[PDB]
Amino acid sequence: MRVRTLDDNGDWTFGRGKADYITSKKAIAQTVSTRIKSWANDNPLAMNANIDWKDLLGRKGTEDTILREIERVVVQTDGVIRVTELEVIKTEKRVQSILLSYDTIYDDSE
């Protein structure tokens, strides 16, 4: 799978066609990285685009469902196999940071 690369801050890239495209194992990385970031009832063309944030960060007691939905999004991605993810800090102020690790379809060629 190809996909246009995004630069550091994550804006789009035009020019260098066929070269601003991520090849693989990093295309999966980019595609998971910003599949997580796709609020659900945003896109009128995909209203279940990805997990529903306005209804999960605005309600108490969803950490388990945040994690289950992140695993859902990641696993249902073209190119990933497994996941290994949990929470690493405990809302250091009130923001919790979770650690997400997944095995792409690559690095399994032995």
């Binding site: 035009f14 020019g15 260098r16 066609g17 066929k18």
Partner: protein, 404 residues
């Protein structure tokens, strides 16, 4: 000049302009000098996006191109043609009056078919009311068009009631109308643009030209209190005029040919507001209820005139010009003949040149003129006669070649 609907019309930007606009935008947003442009991935993509947008813009150009009665050529021609209440005339089955003769006179339903000279069916919708004598019925061709036949006894006795005897009819056929082509419709519409006007000088023309059989038309009005003058007319071509007529004041006048007297009378009686001058006496009737609740028939009798057909003479000389490529007179005759002439229209040298040329013409024309009485040409216009239609026969079209 990108997609400006201005006084100049519509100016949809050309494909290169649209590509330049999108490329300029992409260049400013992303890269001043860097991003690639053509025969390259990003360039091909700009091409695809510009292709979508230019599809839409050329649709705009075509749309405005088809707001023009002289260029419409299609469905949009009729859409623009509904702007007055007229549409293209429909194809009409050809009529065919025959003598049948049945030994009994009960009833004849739809089915019949005759004249196997052509693979044709000419059915009807009515009974027979007279004995074995030759009683006449009317058949409609099964082919919508200018169908016709000649008097042949080759009837296919489809499902005859008794099947009495052959039905050879006298030789006279009504051609039937093939569906009106757009080319005719353009001129008819542009000429009959006053259709919804209900009994004005243009209304008569527009609503007479709808008649199933009419061919050529003109209308006249004498709006003055003074007789023997012509002011209003179907075509402005004759307003120029200053040539004699014999008519009365407050009077209209129709010159028409080919329409059924019944329908012509229907329209004239529904759309006349003054005196009418003519020879043929068309008629109308109308069923009106008296306020006491009775019935009666008014008869509206009004006079119209059928044009006195005539000839026309053309003084033409041709200059062929390629050494040993002689002109073909026959082609020139058969072209200059085929000019449709409107009722009492001014034939002038000035237009006939365009008809005196064929698609691949090796000859030029240097002394052309027209005349009425086979002689005495005059350098410009010459009048046909307010009630006179003209043609150009192959006999009188004289062409004089000059060698080179």
């Amino acid at each position: 000049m990108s997609l400006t609907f201005n006084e100049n019309g519509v100016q949809t930007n050309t494909f290169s302009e649209l590509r330049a606009l999108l490329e300029a935008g992409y260049r400013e947003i992303y890269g001043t000098d860097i991003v690639t442009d053509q025969e390259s991935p990003d360039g091909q993509r700009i091409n695809l996006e510009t292709l979508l947008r230019f599809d839409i813009e050329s649709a705009f150009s075509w749309l405005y191109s088809n707001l023009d009665p002289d260029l419409n050529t299609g469905d949009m021609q009729q859409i623009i043609g509904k702007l007055s209440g007229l549409v293209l005339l429909p194809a009409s089955r050809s009529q065919w009056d025959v003598t049948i003769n049945m030994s009994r006179a009960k009833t004849l339903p739809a089915g019949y078919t005759i004249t196997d000279e052509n693979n044709q069916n000419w059915f009807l919708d009515s009974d027979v009311d007279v004995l074995i004598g030759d009683n006449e019925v009317t058949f409609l061709s099964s082919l919508w068009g200018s169908i016709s036949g000649i008097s042949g006894s080759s009837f296919t006795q489809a499902t005859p009631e008794i099947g009495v005897v052959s039905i050879s009819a006298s030789a006279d056929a009504i051609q039937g109308r093939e569906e009106e082509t757009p080319e005719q419709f353009r001129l008819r519409r542009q000429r009959s643009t006053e259709n919804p006007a209900q009994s004005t000088i243009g209304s008569i023309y527009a609503k007479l030209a709808q008649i199933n059989g009419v061919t050529d038309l003109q209308v006249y009005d004498n709006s003055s209190d003074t007789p023997d003058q012509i002011t209003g007319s179907s075509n402005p071509d004759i307003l120029n005029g200053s040539e004699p007529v014999t008519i009365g004041a407050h009077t209209m006048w129709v010159v028409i040919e080919g329409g059924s007297l019944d329908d012509i009378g229907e329209v004239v009686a529904k759309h006349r507001l003054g005196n009418t001058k003519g020879s043929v006496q068309v008629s109308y009737i109308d069923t009106l209820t008296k306020p006491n609740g009775d019935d009666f028939q008014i008869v509206n009798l009004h006079n119209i005139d059928r044009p006195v057909l005539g000839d026309l003479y053309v003084r033409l000389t041709a200059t062929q010009k390629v050494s040993g490529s002689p002109i073909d007179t026959d082609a020139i005759k058969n072209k200059l003949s085929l000019v449709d002439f409107e009722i009492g229209q001014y034939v002038d040298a000035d237009a006939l040149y365009q008809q005196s040329l064929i698609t691949n013409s090796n000859y030029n024309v240097t002394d052309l003129e027209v005349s009425l009485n086979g002689i005495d040409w005059t350098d410009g216009r010459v009048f046909s006669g307010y009630d006179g239609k003209l043609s150009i026969s192959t006999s009188n079209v004289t062409i004089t070649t000059v060698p080179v």
